Amino acid sequence: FFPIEKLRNYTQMGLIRDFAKGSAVIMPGEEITSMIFLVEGKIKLDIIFEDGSEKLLYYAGGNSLIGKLYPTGNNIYATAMEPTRTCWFSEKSLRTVFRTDEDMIFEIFKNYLTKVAYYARQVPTIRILRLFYELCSSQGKRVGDTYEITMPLSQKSIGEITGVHHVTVSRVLASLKRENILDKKKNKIIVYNLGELKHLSEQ
Amino acid sequence: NFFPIEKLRNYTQMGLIRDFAKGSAVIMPGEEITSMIFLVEGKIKLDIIFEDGSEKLLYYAGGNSLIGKLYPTGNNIYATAMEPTRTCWFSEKSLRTVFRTDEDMIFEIFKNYLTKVAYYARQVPTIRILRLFYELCSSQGKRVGDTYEITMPLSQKSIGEITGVHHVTVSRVLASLKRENILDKKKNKIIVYNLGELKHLS
């Protein structure tokens, strides 16, 4: 959420806007010039790329600060997941805030430094499947009605090879295990359903 | 993308000037930074050492880029000048002085970070190919004199599908591994001549 709690002390200088569940906080194509402080509730923020596709950007919760003051070239469609109270801060109202409390300039800076640092630090599932299939058909040994690949292939290495975030890699492997397709142990990979693994990798 | 903020050049008299020669460290790892760093002239490479000791690129700062920080972020940073570079270090106190003179600069800086967060959220290579060969060689490879042999097919097309690396890049990585006598793929046989150089490159 990247909470900025101190901002609650200054909502009287912004404009309070309440949104019912499901109602749009930010309309598609809408032009936002205010920062949006989430005082209570939850908001889903999808992004809209130019072809027309729609992808979840991030959620926002209590004390989150979203919105913007100037154009960015990202089209945002934001939706209230529950009754939600917001406070909108134009550039003018932020000047008023800052003139009352200089430290609020740095509270907002810290928030955005922290945000940038997270995303930078973080900086497809089909690729993991392709890797396992390649490994199996090439290096897999038949042991009963399973294939075994002898290889210490850590979750981290899989991520570094396929260009996939560590969290998605854990998800994929848990899913492959849950569906009785493949079990990835420490020293071994055991393929239970080569047919389904292969099919899945050709997506 | 350097995300430049040209307007800070009008206020470098309020921070501390610092020049770095090619190779110099701008930020030592574990070194506590409490200053915004304004790259007025040059180019800087930012890496990030993870808690596991591993290192990967972060970003490249350039003319009018604004890096550094006033407070902890949780990112252990190691930065180095890639050419002669002039910077200006802004402490929190120097920023207050700036803002007291020109309130508008607050919003110049804020507009800069709004653009960066837009960039990164929207988003959210050669090394991938090297890491693949290395993992394959260390687990599948059989030592033959001063070499290692791995018996398995592995098309350039497959390598691209597995790593997500553009085929032209794969084309070029394989060509150069071969030229440099590090690794050659002969039909369905992979020969590693220089595993050490392979491990260091990955």
Side-chain angles (χ1 to χ4, degrees), chain A residues 1-185 187 189-203, chain B residues 2-6 8-40 42-44 46-92 94-126 128-185 187-188 190-202:
Chain A
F1 293 146
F2 298 109
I4 168 90
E5 209 174 23
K6 221 76 219 167
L7 204 48
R8 293 191 132 255
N9 294 172
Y10 301 91
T11 44
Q12 68 273 192
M13 286 149 169
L15 297 166
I16 303 304
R17 310 228 292 121
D18 285 336
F19 297 99
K21 175 202 199 58
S23 70
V25 186
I26 300 184
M27 297 273 288
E30 182 181 353
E31 175 194 298
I32 301 300
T33 55
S34 287
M35 299 307 304
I36 305 171
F37 181 60
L38 216 169
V39 359
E40 268 196 21
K42 177 169 186 163
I43 293 170
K44 174 198 213 163
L45 299 83
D46 297 23
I47 172 158
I48 297 163
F49 313 100
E50 170 139 35
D51 52 285
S53 45
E54 166 111 341
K55 220 279 178 177
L56 203 174
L57 228 196
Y58 48 77
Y59 287 93
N63 293 314
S64 293
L65 182 59
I66 59 178
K68 69 208 229 313
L69 299 174
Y70 322 101
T72 62
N74 274 1
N75 194 53
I76 295 302
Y77 178 54
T79 285
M81 308 302 319
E82 55 181 302
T84 294
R85 174 156 299 174
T86 68
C87 181
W88 295 51
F89 288 104
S90 66
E91 179 194 286
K92 180 51 207 175
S93 71
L94 288 181
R95 290 183 187 263
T96 307
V97 166
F98 299 151
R99 300 184 181 184
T100 295
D101 184 1
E102 196 182 78
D103 280 3
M104 282 307 298
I105 293 160
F106 298 98
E107 283 281 339
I108 291 181
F109 274 15
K110 176 190 179 195
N111 181 260
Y112 275 85
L113 275 154
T114 298
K115 282 169 159 159
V116 174
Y118 183 71
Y119 288 115
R121 182 177 175 86
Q122 319 310 300
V123 171
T125 285
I126 312 286
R127 294 177 208 147
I128 303 176
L129 302 176
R130 260 146 210 181
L131 170 60
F132 288 133
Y133 176 67
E134 199 72 12
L135 251 17
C136 193
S137 69
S138 186
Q139 310 304 299
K141 298 183 173 72
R142 180 72 173 250
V143 179
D145 291 321
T146 62
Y147 285 90
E148 291 187 353
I149 310 160
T150 298
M151 176 170 196
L153 183 61
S154 70
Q155 294 200 193
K156 188 185 87 307
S157 288
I158 297 178
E160 301 172 322
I161 283 162
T162 59
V164 173
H165 206 238
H166 57 277
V167 199
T168 298
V169 177
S170 287
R171 194 196 85 205
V172 183
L173 288 179
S175 168
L176 285 172
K177 184 178 204 167
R178 214 282 272 187
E179 304 292 339
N180 296 301
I181 291 165
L182 171 154
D183 190 13
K184 215 248 66 161
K185 325 218 232 93
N187 68 315
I189 296 145
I190 307 162
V191 185
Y192 285 89
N193 195 335
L194 181 53
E196 179 64 358
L197 170 78
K198 176 170 158 63
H199 160 253
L200 288 177
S201 76
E202 286 154 343
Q203 261 174 295
Chain B
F2 296 146
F3 302 110
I5 165 161
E6 292 89 336
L8 265 176
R9 298 166 82 81
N10 298 149
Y11 296 97
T12 53
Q13 340 88 55
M14 324 209 176
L16 175 90
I17 298 292
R18 298 197 60 194
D19 273 47
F20 292 96
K22 186 163 181 293
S24 272
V26 182
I27 305 158
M28 287 186 292
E31 155 179 32
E32 176 207 356
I33 297 297
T34 61
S35 284
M36 298 307 297
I37 311 171
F38 182 56
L39 216 156
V40 12
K43 199 183 201 284
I44 293 173
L46 275 77
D47 282 332
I48 175 162
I49 291 82
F50 295 85
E51 322 83 319
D52 67 4
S54 77
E55 181 164 341
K56 307 182 182 174
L57 189 96
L58 188 77
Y59 31 90
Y60 286 98
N64 292 315
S65 291
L66 186 64
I67 58 178
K69 51 184 165 196
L70 296 161
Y71 328 102
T73 63
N75 286 4
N76 182 27
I77 299 283
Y78 172 60
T80 46
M82 296 198 298
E83 50 170 282
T85 303
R86 169 165 257 174
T87 63
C88 177
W89 287 47
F90 289 101
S91 64
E92 189 181 81
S94 80
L95 288 176
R96 293 180 191 270
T97 299
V98 171
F99 301 149
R100 288 162 191 195
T101 306
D102 186 8
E103 196 183 62
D104 291 349
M105 284 305 96
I106 297 176
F107 299 98
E108 289 289 332
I109 288 178
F110 197 36
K111 178 261 254 39
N112 172 255
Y113 279 81
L114 289 174
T115 307
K116 299 181 168 181
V117 171
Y119 185 71
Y120 289 110
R122 170 182 211 177
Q123 314 272 57
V124 181
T126 290
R128 296 179 193 163
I129 297 176
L130 295 179
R131 289 260 44 240
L132 177 65
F133 279 132
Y134 175 82
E135 292 288 333
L136 255 37
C137 187
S138 80
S139 67
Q140 258 31 252
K142 295 175 177 185
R143 174 183 160 250
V144 172
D146 198 38
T147 88
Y148 277 72
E149 288 187 29
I150 312 160
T151 310
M152 78 184 279
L154 185 63
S155 69
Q156 289 202 198
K157 195 247 274 196
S158 277
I159 286 160
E161 288 168 1
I162 285 162
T163 59
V165 170
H166 182 115
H167 78 242
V168 168
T169 297
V170 179
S171 207
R172 169 154 193 273
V173 173
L174 270 289
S176 97
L177 287 177
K178 189 182 176 206
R179 178 226 284 146
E180 301 311 325
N181 294 299
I182 297 162
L183 181 156
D184 187 13
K185 199 182 81 35
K187 319 115 359 211
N188 292 329
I190 303 177
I191 312 166
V192 179
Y193 303 100
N194 192 345
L195 183 52
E197 182 61 17
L198 183 64
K199 165 184 264 296
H200 171 261
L201 287 177
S202 54

